[PDB]
Design a protein around this ligand. Sequence first.
Ligand code: HEM
Ligand SMILES: O=N[O-]
Ligand SMILES: O=N[O-]
Ligand SMILES: O=N[O-]
Length: 151
Amino acid sequence: GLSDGEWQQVLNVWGKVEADIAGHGQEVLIRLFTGHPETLEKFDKFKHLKTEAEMKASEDLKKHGTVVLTALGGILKKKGHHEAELKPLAQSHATKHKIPIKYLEFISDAIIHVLHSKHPGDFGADAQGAMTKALELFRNDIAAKYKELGF
Ligand code: HEM
Ligand SMILES: O=N[O-]
Ligand SMILES: O=N[O-]
Ligand SMILES: O=N[O-]
């Protein structure tokens, strides 16, 4: 898992996201959809978005960005004690949304990219290390639930 020091870094970095949850959420999703168009196809409500300009101008995309990062933030603040929070997400994403674990890798990478893009020079090597460990823990615990479901 993560050390106390590493969790402290994770939640310090997360303060950046919390100051503009919608903007961070929007950019993470645009980074995901533009880097991996196949992911857009998993959202019936976003597949109409043909261009990044349309994505940027979509208020519903920003709304979903807020939902996604709010859920993640909740999970992170549990500092690994997140079984109850993670279980329903693993289930909905495997069974209902049919999201391969690879796409969770993509969005983890997107979060790291957006943090650098929005805070260049203010996302230090230790911070990236800790946030990356937290996102891997998230992904690893989700993967365990995916395997249970055979997904
Ligand atoms: C940090 C990783 C993620 C978090 C925290 C997250 C969180 C959520 C939450 C809270 C919801 C609404 C409740 C629910 O249906 O469970 C949701 C819905 C959804 N998620 Fe995710 N999600 C993540 C990753 C992804 C990825 C990578 C994809 C696809 C590439 C995806 C596809 C979807 C879809 C299609 C919905 C339903 C959207 C709708 O029609 O309203 N999710 N997600
Ligand atoms: O937990 N301090 O590394
Ligand atoms: O954007 N993930 O639901
Ligand atoms: O209505 N089920 O998302």
